[PDB]
Design a protein around this ligand. Structure first.
Ligand SMILES: [Cl-]
Ligand code: NA
Ligand code: NA
Ligand code: NA
Ligand code: NA
Length: 129
């Protein structure tokens, strides 16, 4: 499913992401925009053989199991396919663990490179939040 911008903002907010670990809703919408272009089905293989899954491109090296990332951890205790669903609950709950890991949203390279320091509030503009 490809979310609309305000549709995603509302679902992230419903699932507790607004200001989670201090990151305002616009940070999460921005991260999703540049990680997956709001597409829950996005996948991207990494050089180390791991794969990033879903609207927030969660990595199989640490966070989910895809059965093909030797020596990976599965810290969110989920199959990576669960991160591809139209319902973003699993992605949100795993993102809450990632952002709590010590590095904040710097765990998302696209957030660091394209959202951090910017006017992330623009990403929830005009939404009935
Ligand atoms: Cl957009
Ligand atoms: Na901010
Ligand atoms: Na894994
Ligand atoms: Na949802
Ligand atoms: Na980037």
């Amino acid at each position: 499913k490809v979310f609309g911008r305000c549709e995603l903002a509302a679902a992230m907010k419903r699932h507790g992401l607004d200001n989670y670990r201090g990151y305002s809703l616009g940070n999460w919408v921005c991260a999703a925009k540049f990680e997956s272009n709001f597409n829950t089905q996005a996948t991207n293989r990494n050089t180390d053989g791991s794969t990033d899954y879903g609207i927030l491109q969660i990595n199989s090296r640490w966070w989910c199991n895809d059965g093909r990332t030797p020596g990976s951890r599965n810290l969110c205790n989920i199959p990576c396919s669960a991160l591809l669903s139209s319902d973003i609950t699993a992605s949100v709950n795993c993102a809450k663990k990632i952002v709590s890991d010590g590095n904040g949203m710097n765990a998302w390279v696209a957030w660091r490179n394209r959202c951090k320091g910017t006017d992330v509030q623009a990403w929830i503009r005009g939404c009935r939040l």
